[PDB]
Amino acid sequence: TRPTVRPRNDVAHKQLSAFGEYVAEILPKYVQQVQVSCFSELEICIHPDGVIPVLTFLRDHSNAQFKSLADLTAVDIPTRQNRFEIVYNLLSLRFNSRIRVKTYTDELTPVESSVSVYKAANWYEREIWDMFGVFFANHPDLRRILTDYGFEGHPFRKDFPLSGYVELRYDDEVKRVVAEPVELAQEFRKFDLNSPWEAFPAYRQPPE
Amino acid sequence: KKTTGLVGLAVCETPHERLKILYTKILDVLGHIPKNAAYRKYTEQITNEKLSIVKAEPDVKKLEEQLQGGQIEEVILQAENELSLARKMIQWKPWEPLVEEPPASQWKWPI
Amino acid sequence: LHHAVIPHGKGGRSSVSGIVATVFGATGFLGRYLVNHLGRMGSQVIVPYRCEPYDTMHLRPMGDLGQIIFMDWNGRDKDSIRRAVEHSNVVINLVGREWETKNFDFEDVFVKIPQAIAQVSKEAGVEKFIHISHLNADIKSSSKYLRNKAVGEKEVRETFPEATIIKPADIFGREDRFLNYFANIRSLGKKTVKQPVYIVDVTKGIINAIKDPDARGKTFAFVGPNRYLLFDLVQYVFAVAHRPRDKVERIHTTDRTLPHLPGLEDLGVQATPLELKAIEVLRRHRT
Amino acid sequence: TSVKPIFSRDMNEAKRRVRELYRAWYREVPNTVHLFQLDISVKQGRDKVREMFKKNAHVTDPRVVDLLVIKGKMELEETINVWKQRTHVMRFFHETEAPRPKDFLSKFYVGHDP
Amino acid sequence: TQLITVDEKLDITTLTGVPEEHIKTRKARIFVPARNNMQSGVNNTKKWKMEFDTRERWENPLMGWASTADPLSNLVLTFSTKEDAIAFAEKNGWSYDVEERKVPKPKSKSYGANFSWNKRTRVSTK
Amino acid sequence: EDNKQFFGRHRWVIYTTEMNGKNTFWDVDGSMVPPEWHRWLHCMTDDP
Amino acid sequence: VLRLVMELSGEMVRKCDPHIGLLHRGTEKLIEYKTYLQALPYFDRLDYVSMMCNEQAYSLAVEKLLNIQPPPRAQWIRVLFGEITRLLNHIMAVTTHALDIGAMTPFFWMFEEREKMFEFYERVSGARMHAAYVRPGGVHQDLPLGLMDDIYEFSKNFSLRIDELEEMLTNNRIWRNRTVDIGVVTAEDALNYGFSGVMLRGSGIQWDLRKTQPYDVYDQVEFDVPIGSRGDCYDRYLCRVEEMRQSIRIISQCLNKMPPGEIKVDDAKVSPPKRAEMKTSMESLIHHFKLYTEGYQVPPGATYTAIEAPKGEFGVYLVSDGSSRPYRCKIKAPGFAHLAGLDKMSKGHMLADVVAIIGTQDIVFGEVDR
Amino acid sequence: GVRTSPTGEKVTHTGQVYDDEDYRRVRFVGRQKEVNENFAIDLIAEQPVSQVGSRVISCDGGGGALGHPRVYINLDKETKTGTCGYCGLQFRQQH
Amino acid sequence: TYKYVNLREPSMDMKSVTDRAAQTLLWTELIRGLGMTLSYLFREPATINYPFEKGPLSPRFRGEHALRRYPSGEERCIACKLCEAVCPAQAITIEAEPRADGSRRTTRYDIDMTKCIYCGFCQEACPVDAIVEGPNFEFSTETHEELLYNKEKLLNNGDKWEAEIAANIQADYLYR
Amino acid sequence: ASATRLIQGLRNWASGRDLQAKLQLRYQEISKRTQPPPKLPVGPSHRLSNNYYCARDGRREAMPPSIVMSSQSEKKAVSPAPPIKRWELSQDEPYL
């Protein structure tokens, strides 16, 4: 078990467990999950109303500094009514630790636009608005950045397929470039690789 | 001091009493906050610990090596932002019990 | 007929459409637009050129991957022409320089070129051969151009009789000849009534007639929608453009309708007027 | 069932914002068709604009109307700047066929399109 | 903050941007994917795949490939319950065909019954 | 092949005229070498 | 290649909108429709100047999720090529800053040295630039006999050539006049605007992911990262050149501390076996076959990691169904994070100074897209 | 070693030669249909049928870890030679 | 550990300040840069005469996409579809049939040279080393039709040489 | 290199770095190609009689993440980690 399998530290696990229990006790208004994985990186799962209060707490308080802001994405999970998952990622300059603030959200109701306390979140929020459509009320400027202007569809969803619906070509008829419905030259074959036989017995969900 | 390692932050000349009136304002605005929650307990405990660090030490460099938050003026700025959360958390009632639940088949991952 | 000539699915960008078209010419104006609309249809075009490959290079990427194909032809041998028309569904004949050269007159391009290609075509077994002609090309006077075209008309009518002999009026567009000469002026003023027809309705009519069978044998003529004076049209050109011998005789010669032969209405295509497309194309004036 | 809408209370503010947005598109069209050196009469462009408005008149849900207003405002900004080129503006139009009608027999000749 | 909310339906098909030809013409199918019969393992069960029906795939006339004018041809959406499947299909607009789940039927077999005395269940080989 | 130059100027080919017949005195292409000399010339070895 | 719409009071500025997204390619979507082993080169080429640290971060992401430690020789070889990649990206950033600021010739001097380094990549794998070569499960197909002495030769000659680069520039008078007064960064700005790596080195706070959280055997080599004092662009230039010189140090100690363990992991259900057992086994042929068709299954969960790309915090965030396909990958890009604060970095300067600001934060404009 | 169909061109080692009614013949105009002129089935009779004195014998392919993997084939068919599915070369038994 | 920069002061001593004034008013280190650049002028430049001298390489370059075959034998490929299963732009296209003999073989083995990113995964995935990344890299093709290889083109390209491919593999069949 | 002594002296006078010694034109220490064929080692597995895969099953050691407070007089307020000690100037020629 020891060679070529990465060992761990239970000490960091106990530290993050006690810290997450502490944060869960002292902000009871929005805490739903505080989960700790095997390799000690914290996850805090949050209702979509305490975005500004929880981030104003987590920027400060001298027990959890966490100035460094990272990724924002809202992992598209169907079979839910609240589809999208806004994932804040926070890194502490003072304590060297990573916490993942996963707040949940639906298709049409906005979360509260974290750019007010995080100046790094501006183009992150603009990117999420362009690729998904998660609206951000009380935001300075929402535009389409990382897509074409005349293109729409919010393509990083699961409803948007791999190929786009439109496809450009130049033509000398109207002496310019026009978009057409997509005419693929090949299929993009689909390999049914989801093999049976239960490779992980621990992660079995209870069937009906 | 003389020209600290940060950039948009010039050195202060009276760190001690400025930091002390900062933390007494922290105790005042915490005195605004209601009682029964433990948020008052943790903030009061850490603030009294840090004030007990600073009251027992009139030094500078030993005060930096003992009190975390190197070097010095980050503690002052962090105290300002701690006052900022204090002012913002008279309102917004973080200690009150929960708003309604998710549909409970959402935070389980493996779909 | 064999498979992969039948249509397949929708249209455009290597969707396998019906016709395989051998085109003579296509380096000029109307043939280039015709290859363009067949590429929008998604039809394989076999075109031979005689010039530098740079011209067929800047009209090359009209098709999809490897659809259109380029080869060589010459105005002398039946072997290269026959090799170009070995396997063809349809074939169109568009050729002609509007001034005599050292090695070619108005005679024997319009005369000798449809003879040999119609010979190897009728010995080859092609169908829906479309031969262009200028409108009102007569046995009458004033043009070696028009009389050699009338001789070629009689040739294509006599041998291989079920050819679509087609004629538009004098067409205008992005690379017009006579509107360019209207721009390249100086002057003189005459009278002639004239109807101009825009180029895209003409080539839409040609591709619709070549893809729609049962409309064969009949010669067609395309009609301009306005049909008024030439000098009023020149005043219109200078007004919209903001500034105050063979070609000029062949525009002053003859412009009439013929009630014998059918035109646009037996095809079902909307006519674009002179005014809209003329405002679209009259760029390149002072600011 | 708690749902937080964007702007709307009833469809009155929806009607108000969409008529103001259409006024903005009306005074948006001639400046752009003069600026991009386009090739289309103003009547045809305005009729295609109001046709695109009349396409989605079948929506009564107010959040959807709010999101349509926000999308139209975004593209009105991006066309009132010079950020979008000639290609996208012509791409709104359809001058390159696309000839496909909705006849039964026409789809029966060029088959397998039910 | 305790705003307007009205208990109604959803109309996301005027937002997701896929054109109305693909909306009203193409048809979805929701099914649990069957066990691929050569293997005998049902980890490939327990999911509700949403698929779209197949359409034309002609021959690519230069290489011998199967091109298609179908961007939606290679979608699959593996779900966990039939209710959320139907809810998502009605939420996003297009039509859908529901096939019902079929478990393997529980049986009653035993080795002693394979070694019967006057019952005809007899192994006859071993 | 010379030794006194550096690594990159050891092994150089001199093409001849019309080995296939396309007047290759001028306009010398690449890949006009047989493959064992394509192993030798690309410095994949130390022996001819 | 970018679009920049600047609004300026004359020969000065007011604001600037960086229109980026010109080079958008859909990399996250394409990885969501592929497997792990197949979609590794997308991670190889989202950034392209640094080329093996991206491999290193993705391989350590998959190994950290999969709870499998590579053999130690694989770790030390990965450290060596991470130092080669660090040296290469910093020297190209210096030379492209020099070429865009003027300064024709040191560009070509250090690119001849980089031509030696691409010869080294060729001898390692075969590719010029985009050598994949780092499988999750340790390095694959190890080095041919006769490479380490060439790296030793390059280390000596390149120490000489980088000292000659500091002979040419660096106390160049007018280049110092060109880039000293521009590019001020407050520590509060360096925190709130989310900067990564070299900006944090240059402006104030001592911060290294390598030193604080050693994700590999970096903890067992003596090196010292240069820090900045004034938070300045010339100071940041000195920081980059001394990080190159520290990379020379780490290459020397890595060549002196090399254990001859093995190439890949001895867990054949993750790394494919080699040819001898492949042509005569049964389990290894089965593992070869199904491992290249399906891809190995990866347990469900969401992980994040981040290593020190020569730009900065190259982060990668994997989200995995129990599957051979990743459900959602995402990349924290130091180029994006550095481009994020351009208005506050260039509120008070002019347009050539803005071009120097685009130079002084190392840019590829592929990785800024994600 | 190629046939010449009445179309008139080179046939291949797959039965894919054209009809007269095709347009793909005329898109072959000007550029030659290059084909491998060293076929596959003819290089089976060139290989001698080896005779090994054992009964259940081996096939590797001429090189350790260079070729196709090991396969052990039987020689119980008294008149039919053993045939490796990978190699394509035969074997016999000599008692 | 950290080693930062730009912590000094201009020395107020008279010699150092008049030396900085001498550099300011006398253009000194500019001429020092001129001297360094003239020292690189008097070197011999390191160029290669391209059509005669070709740049060095490794025995494991990835080029031509050639095929191999058995010693005086048939086609080395089985059509086991591993290369199309691993091909990360799916440029491989295999349609397989057995012939009249009985051994399983192909019909259509197409490499798209457009989509081929040149990984090496089809080389590493091939169990019999049928497809091999070739040695030479000269395609330079004037037409887009000609950049779509057929199986017969690959067999001709594998029968224009094996001795290069065999020499490279026989040198380096031990690393991989 | 491969040049006479007067221009060598002019190179070393324009840049006193002994340019003739190491010049970035490799002549001798190009790696002598066609090396002997290597025999790779196989690491801490293929070891017979003890390699139970049941032990080193790092895929199956993935625990599900443990949970604290949910949707369904305490000596505390500790930090997530011990606070980070400030570094030192390294002796190998710092500034100053």
Ligand SMILES: NC(=O)C1=CN([C@@H]2O[C@H](COP(=O)(O)OP(=O)(O)OC[C@H]3O[C@@H](n4cnc5c(N)ncnc54)[C@H](OP(=O)(O)O)[C@@H]3O)[C@@H](O)[C@H]2O)C=CC1
């Ligand atoms: N208003 C008008 O212009 C009208 C024109 N037409 C007819 O339409 C046709 C096309 O017109 P247009 O495009 O303007 O003129 P072009 O001269 O450009 O078209 C003729 C084409 O055939 C080629 N060609 C002509 N003569 C020779 C020759 N001797 N040898 C080889 N190739 C030759 C031309 O050049 P190349 O060799 O380089 O390919 C060109 O590709 C003409 O026949 C014209 O009479 C009919 C009605 C109205």
Ligand code: SF4
């Ligand atoms: S992996 Fe090799 S043997 Fe298998 S199909 Fe591909 S080329 Fe043929």
Ligand code: SF4
């Ligand atoms: S090298 Fe080319 S053919 Fe081989 S797997 Fe990669 S893309 Fe496919």
Ligand SMILES: [Zn+2]
């Ligand atoms: Zn065999």
